[PDB]
C-alpha cells in the first residue's frame, strides 16, 4: 500500500521527511567522611588505626 510509486507525469508525489532526536546525561556529586579525636589515635590499642 505505502510503496513509493511513480507515474509518467512525474510531480509532487512521495514526499518524505526526517527527524533528529537527542539524548542527555547529567553529573552528580557524592561524598562522605568520618571524624576522630587525638585522644582516639594517641592512646589507642592499635598503632596504625589511621
Amino acid at each position: 500500500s505505502k510503496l513509493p510509486l511513480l507515474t509518467e507525469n512525474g510531480g509532487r508525489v512521495n514526499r518524505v521527511g526526517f527527524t533528529r532526536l537527542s539524548r542527555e546525561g547529567s553529573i552528580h556529586k557524592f561524598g562522605f567522611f568520618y571524624e576522630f579525636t587525638q585522644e582516639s589515635l594517641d592512646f589507642d590499642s592499635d598503632d596504625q588505626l589511621k
Binding site: 511513480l6 509518467e8 507525469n9 512525474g10 510531480g11 509532487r12
Partner: protein
C-alpha cells in the same frame, strides 16, 4: 522562427516536478505587413458551386 527545446532531465526539474520528466518545444515568431499602395491589391467575391 525561434525554437526553444528543453529535453526532460536536469533542465526541467523544479519544486513542482522534482523528478524532471516533462519537456516541451515552443516555436515563437513575429509577423507584420505594410500595405503601401492598396490601390494595386484587388479582390473579387462570388459564390462557388458544390
Amino acid at each position: 522562427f525561434n525554437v526553444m527545446t528543453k529535453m526532460p532531465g536536469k533542465e526541467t526539474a523544479d519544486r513542482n516536478d522534482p523528478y524532471g520528466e516533462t519537456g516541451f518545444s515552443s516555436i515563437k515568431w513575429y509577423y507584420g505587413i505594410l500595405v503601401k499602395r492598396p490601390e494595386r491589391i484587388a479582390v473579387m467575391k462570388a459564390v462557388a458551386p458544390l
